[PDB]
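The passage that follows is intended for readers who have already worked through the single-chain material. We present the inputs for a multi-component assembly, then the predicted structure in tokenized form, and finally a short commentary. You are encouraged to pause after the input and sketch how you expect the pieces to fit together before reading on.
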Amino acid sequence: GNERPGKSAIVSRDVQETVDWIMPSLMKVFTSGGQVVKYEPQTAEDVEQA
Amino acid sequence: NLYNILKEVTENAGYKDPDRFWTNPDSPEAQQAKAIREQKEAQPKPEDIKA
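Having made your guess, compare it with the prediction:
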């Protein structure tokens, strides 16, 4: 909003770069294996339910 | 003791239920199997040769 009519108006990209560099790892974690959750039984009597 | 060792190994491997891979030696089926195993030791070979 401080751009003048006849001068340059280039904008640096920092937040975009940081977000785009963080996201792919955060998806590879939590996505890669096909399965997303694993329920582990507490005792031997819950295994089938688990 | 061997049953306990096998149970510990299996649970460490990641399987909470150990009866899927082993049988408790105190279970009635195990007692029956031991019964037939002992009964098959009725008489060895050469003892009647001796008598």
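Commentary: Chain B is about 55% helix and 0% strand. The two ends of chain B are 40 Å apart (CA to CA). How closely did your sketch match?
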